DNA sequence: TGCGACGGTCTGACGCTCTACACAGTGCCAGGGGGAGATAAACGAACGCTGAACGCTCCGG
């Protein structure tokens, strides 16, 4: 999606393939997010019962978790949970 | 479709004062942006000093 975001002229079939890869990447974004909904629910129930509703805490942690997945890299050899927990 | 019945939904449940009260278990710091207060200077203003100067009654030789 970064390559197709550029203004350089490429093949239209190549741009279609890049859009397909971008759609697959967005599907991966989703799949990771519904993978980690359970852990953000657990860490939100860790912080409940203090004047703020449970589902509000879950959704705010979900915002923190999409922040986490925006700032996650595979170069460091650690699991997603221990890095996501700080942002949650 | 007619049947009860099963169920949810919804409502108020006389009136006032004398009286009448308050509310509780789970992280942490660094980097950076704004405006509050102190500073010393500045352009302009008017504020004083300079007695001088005009004019008066004046006691007067």
From Swiss-Prot:
Residues 32-88 are annotated as: Sigma-70 factor domain-2. Residues 1-88 are annotated as: Binds RNA polymerase-binding protein RbpA. It comes from the Bacteria. A motif (Interaction with polymerase core subunit RpoC) lies at residues 56-59. Belongs to the sigma-70 factor family. Homotrimer (Potential). interacts transiently with the RNA polymerase core complex. Interacts with RNA polymerase-binding protein RbpA via its sigma-2 region (residues 211-347) in a free form. Sigma factors are initiation factors that promote the attachment of RNA polymerase to specific initiation sites and are then released. This sigma factor is the primary sigma factor during exponential growth. Its activity is stimulated by RbpA. This is RNA polymerase principal sigma factor HrdB. It comes from Streptomyces coelicolor (strain ATCC BAA-471 / A3(2) / M145). The chain holds residues 247 to 334 of 511 of the full protein.
